[PDB]
Design a protein around this ligand. Sequence first.
Ligand SMILES: CNCc1ccc(N2CCCCC2)cc1
Ligand SMILES: CNCc1ccc(N2CCCCC2)cc1
Ligand SMILES: CNCc1ccc(N2CCCCC2)cc1
Ligand SMILES: CNCc1ccc(N2CCCCC2)cc1
Lengths: 187, 187
Amino acid sequence: DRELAILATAENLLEDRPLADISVDDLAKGAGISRPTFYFYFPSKEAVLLTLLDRVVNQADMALQTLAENDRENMWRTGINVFFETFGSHKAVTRAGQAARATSVEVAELWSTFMQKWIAYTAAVIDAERDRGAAPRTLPAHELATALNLMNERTLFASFAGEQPSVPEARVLDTLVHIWVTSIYGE
Amino acid sequence: DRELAILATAENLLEDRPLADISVDDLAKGAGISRPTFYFYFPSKEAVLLTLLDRVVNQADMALQTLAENDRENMWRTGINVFFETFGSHKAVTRAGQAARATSVEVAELWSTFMQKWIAYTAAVIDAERDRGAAPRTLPAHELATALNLMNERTLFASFAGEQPSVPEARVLDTLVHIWVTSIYGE
Ligand SMILES: CNCc1ccc(N2CCCCC2)cc1
Ligand SMILES: CNCc1ccc(N2CCCCC2)cc1
Ligand SMILES: CNCc1ccc(N2CCCCC2)cc1
Ligand SMILES: CNCc1ccc(N2CCCCC2)cc1
C-alpha cells in the first residue's frame, strides 16, 4: 500500500533530520512513487506528520483505554508507563509532532484533545481514591491532574530528546511515579 | 536610545502577533528609525527576540539570586513565585522565546543554561533539607529537582498562554507548591 509506504518513509526520515529538511521528493522517492502520486494521498508533508502523530496518539489512547477497562503505586506506574513506552517507541514522530504544535492548529488540537481526555480520567481516579478514603482532599483533583500530566508530557519529552536538562530515560518513570504518588496521597 | 526603542517596539508587537508576522520594517517604524539603522543594532528580528528573552531571564535569575542570598512551604512558594511573576510580566516575550527554542540554538542554550542553574540550586536545597533531617531521602535530589522544575516550566507556560489544558493562572502557584512540598517532604 502506497499510503503506508509514505508514512513509513516519513517516520524513517524523521529519525535523521527534522521535517524542514525533508522534501516531498524525499518522501515520494522512499515510498517508490512519483510526486503527483504522493499528492493524491497527502496535500503536504505536514499532513503526513499529522497522520503519523494521530497513529501514535491513538496507540497510546487505546492502550490506556485497555488498562482503564480492567497496590496504588503500581496502579499509577502502569498507566504512566503507557506514555513512556508508546511515545518512546516513536521518538522521532513525537519530537516532530511536538515541534509542529507551534505552527499547526490541527496538531495542537490533536495533542490538546488527547491530554484533556486523560487529565479528566486522572482526576476521576483521584476523586475515586478520595471517595474511598485512600487519598486526602487537598488540591482540586482536576487542577492536580492537569499539573501532573503536564509534568509527564514535558519530562518524558525531555528524556526522549536527550535535552539538557532532563531526567535520564532509565530513571524517568521512577521519578514521575514518586511525584504522582506523594502529591496524590500526601497531606 | 534607539536600541531600547527597538526592544520596546518588539515586545509591544509580540503581544498582538507572532514573530513571523512582524517585519524589520515594523520594528524600525515603531522605533522611529530606518531599516539600515535597525541593522546596525541587530542582524535580524530573531536577534531582537534573543535580546528580549535574555533580559527577562536575567531578571528572574537576579531575583532568585537575591532570595538565595538572604516555614518550609513558604520558602518554596516564594521562589516559585519569582518565575510566576517575572515571566508572567512578560508573557509575549516568554511565549515567543519558548517557540523560538525549536529553531534557534542560541535561544535553546539560553533556556538550558538558566534551567540547569536553578535545578542545581533546587537540588542543593533539597540535599540541605535532607542533611538536617527535615526531608526524607527518597529520589536522587537532582532527578527530583529536574522533574519539578520541568513541571513548573510547562505548567506556568500553559497558564500564561491560556492553553487547553491548563491550570487557571489564579490557581497555578498553589498547585505547583502542593506538588513540590509533598514530593520533597513526603515518604
Ligand atoms: C484502573 N485504572 C487503571 C489506570 C488507567 C490509566 C492510568 N493513567 C495514569 C497516567 C495518566 C493517564 C491515566 C492509571 C491507571
Ligand atoms: C493527560 N495527558 C497526559 C500526557 C502525558 C505525556 C504525554 N507525552 C507526549 C509527548 C512525549 C512524552 C509523553 C502526553 C500526554
Ligand atoms: C533560602 N532559599 C531561598 C530560595 C531560593 C530559590 C528557590 N527556588 C525554588 C523554585 C526553583 C528555583 C529555586 C527557593 C528558595
Ligand atoms: C530550574 N528552571 C526552573 C524554571 C521554571 C519555570 C520556567 N518558566 C519559563 C517559561 C514560562 C514559565 C516559567 C523556567 C525555568
